Amino acid sequence: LLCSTPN
Amino acid sequence: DCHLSDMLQQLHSVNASKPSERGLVRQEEAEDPACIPIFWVSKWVDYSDKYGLGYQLCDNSVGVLFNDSTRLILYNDGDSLQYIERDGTESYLTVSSHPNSLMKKITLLKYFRNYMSEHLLKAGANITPREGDELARLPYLRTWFRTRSAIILHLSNGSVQINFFQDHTKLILCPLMAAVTYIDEKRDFRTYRLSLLEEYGCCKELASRLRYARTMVDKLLSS
Prior knowledge:
It is classed as transferase. By secondary structure, chain A is mainly beta. Chain A has one strand spanning 2-3.
């Protein structure tokens, strides 16, 4: 998948 | 689309004033905190290979725009739902009401909510959104797309958000406030009245993002 900015 | 056509004119107008080509640029004079948005997309997950795009709004409500173009919105109470068909027909329910046809899409929305809670940062986390009154309501994601440089998020309240990949800068444009909120590369959040940006000028950074935005709104309108 593609995701917004991780922790 | 009324909201999008207004937004296109607002952006054509501000870009036409060439706000970064000035002897004196005073961007801070165009800042207006009465214009801060009520909502923006805080976290997102593109699983459109399999289900669609899940997202979180700055209020902690979550939504999914499914590959069948329906949306399911779970409010920040953890129970109340809004379901929108492809045509925009809205239903209002609750999880606890147990709608048989939605049970799977609810499971999926729950797996998105968990993923985002576990792994993703909340864009604009420190920021207080403006308090909405009786003329505003919680929006759903009407559509989105990615380019090589950004994701473009179009909400049903007319707001268009653009999150830039390499530098993490973000724009939230609202056509009713006729304003833009710019989240810069230090994560400073500021809201500008577009008409004042024409009056007082802006940096090259913001000006260039606004030209980019105009192009993406043109893309939204065509489709």
